[PDB]
Point group: C2
Chain length 504, copies 2
């Protein structure tokens, strides 16, 4: 009869709704604090798995349907509790399913404040502090990349896929600025280059931006999943022999599956020779720039024309936090500006070059900076460094543990460059067969079955995927500071235990 | 002591940091609660304005610079307090600067939960509840638009600008699917049509997607800022006469400045006749679909092939909340899919049609659904309706108040269709008049001066802008349920006060 007789219409801005608003929000916070507590407790399941149809039918009875009339605030609080009950705990020490794992407390605080501030990034006028924080943070990132203060630009975007899109748009504007007014049909045939094992967002941007996927050329990778530079130069020559114009390459920089690093320095030499825009996709591998021990894997990045870097991956900033960094200033502005009305707006009393909105592809833009800035203040560069180092350390631990075991087979020959560890579990019946197309078809079914059993028990989660002619394999990854040695020991033992229950 | 010698490294996941984690977060919440309290208090300033260099060149105990070593949690709490101190209160009853104004308490709660859940929208695997909420909500939105309850399509996007971009991509794939593989050079000179007063995101997507801005054709508007269908038809004929290929029109649907509504039904007739994709940009005007009294302004929308609708504007959902709705299912999937790795994954144990990420242009995608879904549960459709109705009511009040005053001049002849009220403050010197390029040069300087004085005093904020040949004018807008009639009285009196100063 308290919250069960109260409605949202009775809260602020409703006259003198202050105390009840405070009490409601404190009741919400209480629910979230309990969830935060349980996230770091290993007795808690990673997830209570339900098929889509189970939750759609009233489970139980959590009602997802919408209606004409309001529910009570008590029912709203119940809906909050149930939503968290049936979701996946992405902060759990034993959640290894994605590249982004864990729950940073400072990041969480930063997020809660950002939501309270509730503003757009497009002008200094309504986001003065956040605009300056972005400027400070972006330049710091460019310094870490190895670029000089002489030049530099950048913006945060809604995901690294869109950061990658930015780089291609910027590269096309630098070389063929007439595309903006006249379109793709008014310039020569432009061709892009990316690794066979690079992220699909390159092809996606290729299609979206009017290049066509036929004109996104995949470069051959060696055994370790790295671009072979000789193939890159050969593809360039092949393109211009038929009258096409090579203008852009994407180097990764920490691939999504292998965690491989493309040889940036060799690629840069070829780019300098043929005048190609060099983009480095460090969405995943960019975290390693924070480590003195590991940053050498990105050597040559200082020669890139642009860099994609996702703090929301390795640095464990909360979703989303993705930057595109561009060496030369003015390219993003020139490429994207429409000088509308109305929003920018040259006769403001302040320097309108702080209205960053017109160099974006977005109009309205969510504030992603505060959570990241605050975390950097709370940790220091050394904080990120130590965190990244231990993640990579326990990835080495994992690799060494399974490296020479009969139960496991490594997908490729080579030490992992990132926290990615790619392996098959080999069931007893398959050990020493040997390798055959019939063996691969049976092996293919092993990973999805084990994953199904993982999700049913809710003990752990890890991703599986095929690649090229390889059958489904586990891609283990570590980015969660909550993950410990015993959590890795647990996972290994769990996969083995579940590999002995393939008969359901 | 307390937090003076505690650090982030001592909090969870650190072994014994549970008690200090809870206490820290409760101290953060306390700061946010005080800010929420003050947001709805009219004694509080909307903003304490500072030039960028003023904030950069040191504020007391507040360093923006980053360093190698951590600050104490006490200093972190101070940084939070200072950040909010020097920002703009977008929830303030007297904040009228943008189309998105106000602070919804349920929306705020929803946001806090979403951040705690911290997940991606791309698969049912890691976002089971949120994926279903999105499916339920999108179909409800399609029903409100007037489309079928079965099938249909849509997705939430990071802004209405990108929702607009989706619609052009979808139309292009529907009409010219060869572009995806061959590029734009395989189908020379495709053109897009949009109003002269439509949102710049159409031109922006035109440039980005390879059409060229030359091939984004602007349609003439009448006195009231509406597309002249006449005109629309004439430009189509002109375009195909020179060999170009029309395929797409954008109708708005609630324009950013005038708040005008394009005549969708007449445009739809022309689209049906010439086989053009009809997109309705209801980013701003879409909130009016929730009102039985006002939804008629969007009559014909049921005939659209796609609709952009931003709950984060009129419905007052916290940024960002934007949907693209597509009548025909499978277009977004066909247009956008890359069928990678990873993730998708076709051989999962659950129905993989519930993995929706491959029809997006994004890979990773922020959960924008919960805050919106929760607000809808908390308010009901009737809740949104009553809220929308009062905002439009006090926009009528404003219009009537200044309509026949010597101090004010209306930018165009006609009653506002939305909450947008466009007017000049005319100082004594320019009464009256006559209209000339010489006079417009003087009037242009008025609005920016008053705005500068507004921001200095921090009493209120309202936008100003030019359009075509018109000098800078004020564009008042109302979307904040906290705004009252007395706040409208205050703003008007404040404009007049600042007007001769």
């Amino acid at each position: 009869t308290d919250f069960s007789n109260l409605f949202a219409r009775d809260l602020l801005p409703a006259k003198n709704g202050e105390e009840q608003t405070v009490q409601f929000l404190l009741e919400v916070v209480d629910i979230l604090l309990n969830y935060v507590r349980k996230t770091f407790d290993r007795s808690t399941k990673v997830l209570d798995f339900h098929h889509p149809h189970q939750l759609l039918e009233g489970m139980e009875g959590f009602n997802l349907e919408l209606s004409d009339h309001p529910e009570s605030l008590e029912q709203i609080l119940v809906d909050c509790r149930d939503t968290l009950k049936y979701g996946v705990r992405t902060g759990h020490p034993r959640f290894f399913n994605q590249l982004s794992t864990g729950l940073d407390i400072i990041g969480l605080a930063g997020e809660w404040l950002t939501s309270t501030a509730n503003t757009n990034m497009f002008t200094y006028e309504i986001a003065p502090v956040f605009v300056l924080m972005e400027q400070i943070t972006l330049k710091k990132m460019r310094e870490i990349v190895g670029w000089s203060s002489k030049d530099g630009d950048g913006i945060f975007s809604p995901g690294g896929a869109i950061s990658n899109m930015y780089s291609i748009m910027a590269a096309r504007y630098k070389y063929f600025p007439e595309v903006k007014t006249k379109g793709m049909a008014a310039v020569p045939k432009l061709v892009l280059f990316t690794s066979e094992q690079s992220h699909y967002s390159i092809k996606k941007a290729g299609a979206a931006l009017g290049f066509g996927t036929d004109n996104v050329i995949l470069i051959k990778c060696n055994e370790r999943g790295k671009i072979i530079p000789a193939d890159f130069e050969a593809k360039i020559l092949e393109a211009k022999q038929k009258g096409y114009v090579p203008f852009y390459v994407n180097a990764t920089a920490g691939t999504t599956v292998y965690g491989a690093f493309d040889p940036i320095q060799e690629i840069a030499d070829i780019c300098e020779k043929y005048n190609l825009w060099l983009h480095v996709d460090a969405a995943w591998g960019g975290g390693l720039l924070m480590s003195r021990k590991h940053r050498h894997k990105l050597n040559g990045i200082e020669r890139a024309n642009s860099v994609t870097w996702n703090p929301h991956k390795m640095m464990g900033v909360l979703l989303q936090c993705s930057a595109i960094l561009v060496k030369e200033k003015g390219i993003l502005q020139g490429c994207n500006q429409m000088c509308a009305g109305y929003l920018f707006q040259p006769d403001k009393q302040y320097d309108v070059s702080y209205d960053t909105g017109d160099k974006a592809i977005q109009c309205g833009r969510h504030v992603d900076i505060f959570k990241f800035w605050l975390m950097w203040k709370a940790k220091g560069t050394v904080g990120f460094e130590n965190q990244i180092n231990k993640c990579l350390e326990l990835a080495e631990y994992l690799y060494a543990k399974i490296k020479n075991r009969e139960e496991f087979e490594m997908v490729f020959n080579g030490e992992p460059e990132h926290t990615n560890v790619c392996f098959w579990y080999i069931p007893q019946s398959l050990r020493g067969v040997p390798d055959s197309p019939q063996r691969r078809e049976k092996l293919h079914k092993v990973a999805p079955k084990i994953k199904a059993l993982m999700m049913e028990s809710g003990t752990t989660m890890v991703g599986y995927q095929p690649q090229g002619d390889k059958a489904n394999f586990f891609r283990m990854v570590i980015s969660n500071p909550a993950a410990t040695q015993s959590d890795i020991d647990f996972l290994i033992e769990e996969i083995e235990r579940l590999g002995q229950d393939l008969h359901h």
